[PDB]
Amino acid sequence: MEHVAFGSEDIENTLAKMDDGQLDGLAFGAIQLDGDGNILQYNAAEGDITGRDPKQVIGKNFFKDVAPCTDSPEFYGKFKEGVASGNLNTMFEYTFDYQMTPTKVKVHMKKALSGDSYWVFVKRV
Ligand SMILES: *C(=O)/C=C\c1ccc(O)cc1
């Protein structure tokens, strides 16, 4: 298992070296979205939390298709604000409840080191 702590200050640098396979080795869920909310990456830990099969969600829009409970000012709103601002680094609790047992989680969104890509890190609370 890759040794990286949720919420680590330089997490974006560390994950820039990881391929989809090493990303599956994290202790928390990790989703990479492009500026429009499309899923580029989605690790195994996230699949365990959301129950969705990784390879099947990639390419799908996170706010419209996959996680509609996140289509709100509290989640999607902070994301859209961050993309347009070109900066994003926020953490908060949220409850995941679309087609799944209501699950409380800690979310951490942060701009990737890459160009137009952003990270959503998820862990159980
Ligand atoms: C609200 O809907 C939050 C998260 C979420 C994640 C994965 C899937 O499939 C649905 C919903």
Q: Where are the domains of the chain?
A: 1-125
The CATH label, of 1.20.120.530, 3.40.630.30, 3.20.19.10, 3.30.450.20, for the domain at 1-125 is 3.30.450.20
Residue 14, both tokens: 């560390």
Residues 6+ apart with CB under 8 A from 41: 20, 23, 30, 31, 32, 58
Determine contact, residues 16/112, Cβ cutoff 8 Å. Answer: yes
Output the residue whose Cα is nearest ligand 1's atom 1.
69
| Structural biology method used | X-ray
Tell whether ligand 1 has an atom less than 6 A from the beta carbon of residue 122: no
Residue 13, both tokens: 């640098």
Nearest-CA neighbor of 11 among 105, 107, 110, 123?
Answer: 110
Tell whether ligand 1 has an atom less than 6 A from the beta carbon of residue 110: no
Residue 23, both tokens: 């990303």
Report the separation in Å between the CA atom of 69 and the middle of ligand 1, taken as the mean of its atom positions: 6
